[PDB]
Amino acid sequence: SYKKIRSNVYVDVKPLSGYEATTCNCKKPDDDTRKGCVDDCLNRMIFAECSPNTCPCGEQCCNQRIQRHEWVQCLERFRAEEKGWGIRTKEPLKAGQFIIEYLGEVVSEQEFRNRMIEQYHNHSDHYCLNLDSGMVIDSYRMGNEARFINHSCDPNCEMQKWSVNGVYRIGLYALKDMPAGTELTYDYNFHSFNVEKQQLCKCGFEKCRGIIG
Ligand SMILES: C[S@@+](CC[C@H](N)C(=O)[O-])C[C@H]1O[C@@H](n2cnc3c(N)ncnc32)[C@H](O)[C@@H]1O
Ligand SMILES: [Zn+2]
Ligand SMILES: [Zn+2]
Ligand SMILES: [Zn+2]
């Protein structure tokens, strides 16, 4: 029962990273076929996508994934046993691959708290990641499919914080290759917000830490 958005909705804050990542220097290819910014390009080293208007690789680069909204067209929602809904791929996924950007209403730490008691009173799930400087990305009412990814103590994905054109945004990247049909997951510990609301983890894992978060 959420509203589908294609981009973050900035409520009362601004996640300005404060660092103008420019001149990624990594050289441009030669074949339209292949890509431009290998596993290098000085920018990707400080998790800062390249500003289109300067990247040596022109329109055919690969470190602007979050900007160009280059999400994977495979994710499929589905009923996860004792975890309600969940997301999974229909196409395999090499590791380190950009999977999708995590959207929502980016709000302050206090703006969220209020929502946490003023509206998310009688609520079961927890939809929001830590963004930066207390600012949070709330997705209880708005966001995309990522809001549907479950937690695992042995994640196959990691949420990463990148400076995009001067604004911190969060993308979901794979940690390990995955066979089609595999459910995407990430560790809510260093990413998801902090509310003493707790739940038993149906992670289904050997050394599972027992509790979410
Ligand atoms: C943002 S939602 C993920 C989508 C959700 N499964 C649904 O049906 O709408 C987060 C909630 O899903 C459930 N969940 C996600 N991962 C879980 C896990 N490993 N174990 C148990 N519950 C999980 C918990 O209620 C948690 O608060
Ligand atoms: Zn570069
Ligand atoms: Zn670039
Ligand atoms: Zn677990």
Short mmCIF file of C-alpha atoms and ligand atoms in Angstrom, two decimals:
data_model
loop_
_atom_site.label_atom_id
_atom_site.label_comp_id
_atom_site.label_asym_id
_atom_site.label_seq_id
_atom_site.Cartn_x
_atom_site.Cartn_y
_atom_site.Cartn_z
CA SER A 1 0.00 0.00 0.00
CA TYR A 2 2.76 2.41 -1.04
CA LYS A 3 3.18 5.13 -3.65
CA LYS A 4 5.47 4.33 -6.57
CA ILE A 5 8.14 6.96 -7.24
CA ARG A 6 11.05 6.97 -9.67
CA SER A 7 13.21 9.36 -7.63
CA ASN A 8 13.79 10.50 -4.07
CA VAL A 9 11.41 13.05 -2.62
CA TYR A 10 13.31 15.58 -0.52
CA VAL A 11 11.15 16.63 2.37
CA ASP A 12 13.00 18.77 4.92
CA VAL A 13 16.62 18.05 4.15
CA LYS A 14 19.48 17.92 1.68
CA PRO A 15 22.19 15.17 1.61
CA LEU A 16 24.91 17.39 0.06
CA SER A 17 28.07 15.26 0.18
CA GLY A 18 30.16 18.37 -0.10
CA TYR A 19 32.70 17.02 -2.55
CA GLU A 20 32.81 17.86 -6.26
CA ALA A 21 34.03 14.62 -7.87
CA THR A 22 35.39 15.62 -11.30
CA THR A 23 37.81 14.50 -14.07
CA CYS A 24 37.58 10.73 -13.48
CA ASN A 25 40.51 10.58 -15.89
CA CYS A 26 40.03 6.89 -16.73
CA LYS A 27 40.44 6.81 -20.55
CA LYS A 28 37.70 6.30 -23.15
CA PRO A 29 37.33 2.96 -25.03
CA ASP A 30 37.44 2.51 -28.80
CA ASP A 31 34.49 0.18 -29.37
CA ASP A 32 30.88 1.21 -28.70
CA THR A 33 30.65 -2.44 -27.76
CA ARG A 34 32.76 -2.37 -24.58
CA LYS A 35 32.42 0.05 -21.66
CA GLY A 36 34.48 3.06 -20.55
CA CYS A 37 35.26 3.17 -16.82
CA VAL A 38 36.81 -0.16 -15.78
CA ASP A 39 37.18 -1.31 -12.18
CA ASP A 40 39.18 1.91 -11.79
CA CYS A 41 38.51 5.56 -12.73
CA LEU A 42 39.64 7.68 -9.75
CA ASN A 43 36.03 8.68 -9.05
CA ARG A 44 34.57 5.25 -8.38
CA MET A 45 37.39 4.99 -5.81
CA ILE A 46 35.72 7.54 -3.55
CA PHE A 47 32.24 6.27 -4.37
CA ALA A 48 31.54 9.37 -6.45
CA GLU A 49 29.85 8.82 -9.79
CA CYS A 50 31.19 10.93 -12.65
CA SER A 51 29.64 14.24 -13.63
CA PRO A 52 28.51 13.56 -17.24
CA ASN A 53 29.80 16.96 -18.33
CA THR A 54 33.49 16.03 -17.99
CA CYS A 55 33.91 12.27 -17.92
CA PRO A 56 36.54 11.27 -20.53
CA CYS A 57 34.40 8.30 -21.55
CA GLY A 58 31.42 10.33 -22.75
CA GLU A 59 27.91 8.88 -23.01
CA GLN A 60 29.52 5.44 -22.93
CA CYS A 61 30.90 5.35 -19.40
CA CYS A 62 29.72 3.13 -16.55
CA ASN A 63 30.17 5.18 -13.41
CA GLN A 64 26.93 7.16 -13.68
CA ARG A 65 24.68 4.14 -13.02
CA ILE A 66 22.61 5.89 -10.32
CA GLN A 67 22.11 9.04 -12.41
CA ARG A 68 21.13 7.34 -15.65
CA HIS A 69 18.73 5.20 -13.58
CA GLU A 70 20.30 2.03 -15.00
CA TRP A 71 18.40 -0.36 -12.74
CA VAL A 72 18.30 -4.09 -13.45
CA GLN A 73 15.13 -5.07 -15.34
CA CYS A 74 14.75 -8.43 -13.65
CA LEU A 75 13.76 -8.01 -10.03
CA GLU A 76 10.49 -9.77 -9.24
CA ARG A 77 8.51 -9.41 -6.06
CA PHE A 78 7.33 -12.66 -4.49
CA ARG A 79 5.97 -14.34 -1.34
CA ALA A 80 8.87 -15.20 0.96
CA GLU A 81 7.86 -17.98 3.37
CA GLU A 82 7.77 -16.40 6.83
CA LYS A 83 8.84 -12.95 5.62
CA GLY A 84 5.87 -11.58 3.71
CA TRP A 85 7.05 -10.12 0.41
CA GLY A 86 10.54 -10.17 -1.02
CA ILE A 87 12.57 -9.47 -4.13
CA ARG A 88 14.38 -11.86 -6.42
CA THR A 89 16.11 -11.93 -9.79
CA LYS A 90 14.90 -13.78 -12.87
CA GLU A 91 18.30 -13.19 -14.49
CA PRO A 92 21.63 -14.16 -12.89
CA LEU A 93 23.79 -11.37 -11.46
CA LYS A 94 27.56 -11.15 -11.48
CA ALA A 95 28.91 -9.72 -8.23
CA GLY A 96 29.69 -6.05 -7.68
CA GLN A 97 26.88 -5.27 -10.06
CA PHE A 98 24.64 -2.22 -9.54
CA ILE A 99 21.20 -3.59 -8.84
CA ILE A 100 18.92 -0.62 -8.11
CA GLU A 101 18.77 2.72 -6.29
CA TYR A 102 16.93 2.85 -2.96
CA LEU A 103 14.28 5.58 -3.05
CA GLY A 104 11.98 7.20 -0.53
CA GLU A 105 11.32 10.41 1.36
CA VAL A 106 14.64 11.64 2.67
CA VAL A 107 13.85 13.37 5.96
CA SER A 108 15.77 14.52 9.04
CA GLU A 109 16.33 12.39 12.12
CA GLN A 110 13.64 14.29 14.05
CA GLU A 111 11.20 14.47 11.16
CA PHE A 112 11.30 10.66 11.08
CA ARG A 113 11.00 10.14 14.83
CA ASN A 114 7.79 12.14 14.70
CA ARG A 115 6.53 9.98 11.88
CA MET A 116 7.71 6.99 13.92
CA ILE A 117 5.16 7.73 16.63
CA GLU A 118 2.72 10.15 15.02
CA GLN A 119 1.88 7.75 12.16
CA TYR A 120 3.81 4.46 12.14
CA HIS A 121 2.16 3.75 15.49
CA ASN A 122 0.60 0.33 14.83
CA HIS A 123 2.99 -0.90 12.10
CA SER A 124 4.69 -4.26 11.57
CA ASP A 125 7.51 -3.70 9.03
CA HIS A 126 10.40 -1.18 8.99
CA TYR A 127 10.97 0.72 5.73
CA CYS A 128 14.01 3.03 5.83
CA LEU A 129 17.77 3.20 5.53
CA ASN A 130 20.26 5.46 7.22
CA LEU A 131 21.41 7.98 4.63
CA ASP A 132 23.76 10.47 6.18
CA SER A 133 24.05 12.92 9.08
CA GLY A 134 20.91 11.56 10.68
CA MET A 135 19.04 12.24 7.46
CA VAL A 136 17.09 9.08 6.65
CA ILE A 137 15.39 7.72 3.56
CA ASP A 138 11.86 6.93 4.71
CA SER A 139 9.93 4.57 2.45
CA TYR A 140 6.83 3.69 4.50
CA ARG A 141 4.75 5.57 1.93
CA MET A 142 6.95 6.19 -1.10
CA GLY A 143 9.78 4.44 -2.91
CA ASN A 144 10.51 1.62 -5.34
CA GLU A 145 10.94 -2.15 -5.29
CA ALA A 146 13.99 -1.99 -3.03
CA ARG A 147 11.63 -1.31 -0.16
CA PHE A 148 10.78 -4.99 -0.62
CA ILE A 149 14.19 -6.51 -0.06
CA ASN A 150 14.57 -8.67 3.04
CA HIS A 151 17.32 -8.90 5.63
CA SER A 152 19.85 -11.69 5.86
CA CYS A 153 22.71 -12.39 8.21
CA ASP A 154 24.55 -13.74 5.20
CA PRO A 155 23.65 -11.06 2.55
CA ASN A 156 24.24 -11.32 -1.18
CA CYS A 157 23.86 -7.54 -1.51
CA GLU A 158 25.14 -4.41 0.19
CA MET A 159 23.68 -0.90 0.21
CA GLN A 160 26.38 1.60 -0.76
CA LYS A 161 26.43 5.36 -0.23
CA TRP A 162 27.58 7.33 -3.31
CA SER A 163 27.95 11.07 -3.90
CA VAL A 164 25.90 11.77 -7.00
CA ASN A 165 26.43 15.19 -8.55
CA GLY A 166 27.01 16.49 -5.05
CA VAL A 167 24.14 14.61 -3.40
CA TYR A 168 24.45 11.43 -1.32
CA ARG A 169 22.27 8.71 -2.75
CA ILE A 170 22.11 5.02 -2.00
CA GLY A 171 22.40 2.16 -4.40
CA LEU A 172 22.11 -1.58 -3.88
CA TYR A 173 25.10 -3.56 -5.14
CA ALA A 174 25.63 -7.32 -5.30
CA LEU A 175 28.39 -8.91 -3.23
CA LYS A 176 28.41 -12.32 -4.93
CA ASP A 177 27.19 -13.72 -8.27
CA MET A 178 23.65 -15.09 -8.10
CA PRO A 179 21.72 -17.73 -10.04
CA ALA A 180 18.36 -16.65 -11.47
CA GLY A 181 15.60 -17.21 -8.91
CA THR A 182 17.80 -16.13 -6.03
CA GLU A 183 16.22 -13.76 -3.48
CA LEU A 184 18.12 -10.49 -3.04
CA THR A 185 19.01 -9.52 0.52
CA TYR A 186 21.18 -7.15 2.57
CA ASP A 187 22.28 -6.70 6.18
CA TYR A 188 20.02 -4.20 7.94
CA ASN A 189 22.70 -3.65 10.60
CA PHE A 190 25.01 -0.97 9.20
CA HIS A 191 22.27 0.47 6.97
CA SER A 192 18.68 0.27 8.28
CA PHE A 193 17.63 2.82 10.91
CA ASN A 194 17.68 2.32 14.67
CA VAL A 195 14.32 1.64 16.37
CA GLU A 196 14.13 -0.65 19.38
CA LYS A 197 11.31 -2.43 17.57
CA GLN A 198 12.67 -5.96 17.13
CA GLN A 199 11.74 -9.09 15.25
CA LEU A 200 12.81 -12.72 15.06
CA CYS A 201 14.88 -13.37 11.97
CA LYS A 202 13.65 -16.01 9.54
CA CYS A 203 16.90 -15.41 7.69
CA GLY A 204 17.39 -19.16 7.48
CA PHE A 205 21.11 -19.32 8.05
CA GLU A 206 23.64 -21.45 9.91
CA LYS A 207 25.18 -18.83 12.19
CA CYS A 208 22.16 -16.51 11.96
CA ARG A 209 22.34 -13.89 14.69
CA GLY A 210 18.73 -14.69 15.63
CA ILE A 211 17.40 -11.11 15.62
CA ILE A 212 17.00 -8.51 12.85
CA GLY A 213 19.41 -5.64 13.38
C1 LIG B 1 10.81 -3.24 4.19
S1 LIG B 1 9.99 -4.75 4.66
C2 LIG B 1 10.55 -5.99 3.43
C3 LIG B 1 9.25 -6.40 2.67
C4 LIG B 1 8.23 -7.21 3.49
N1 LIG B 1 8.68 -8.63 3.61
C5 LIG B 1 6.75 -7.16 3.07
O1 LIG B 1 6.04 -8.20 2.96
O2 LIG B 1 6.19 -6.07 2.81
C6 LIG B 1 10.84 -5.20 6.19
C7 LIG B 1 10.04 -6.22 7.01
O3 LIG B 1 9.91 -7.49 6.44
C8 LIG B 1 10.06 -8.50 7.37
N2 LIG B 1 11.42 -9.09 7.08
C9 LIG B 1 12.34 -8.70 6.17
N3 LIG B 1 13.43 -9.50 6.25
C10 LIG B 1 13.19 -10.44 7.22
C11 LIG B 1 13.86 -11.54 7.80
N4 LIG B 1 15.07 -11.99 7.46
N5 LIG B 1 13.27 -12.24 8.84
C12 LIG B 1 12.03 -11.94 9.27
N6 LIG B 1 11.35 -10.90 8.75
C13 LIG B 1 11.92 -10.17 7.73
C14 LIG B 1 9.99 -7.84 8.73
O4 LIG B 1 8.63 -7.58 9.16
C15 LIG B 1 10.61 -6.50 8.38
O5 LIG B 1 10.23 -5.40 9.20
ZN ZN B 2 36.83 7.53 -14.97
ZN ZN B 3 32.97 8.35 -15.78
ZN ZN B 4 19.28 -14.20 10.30
#
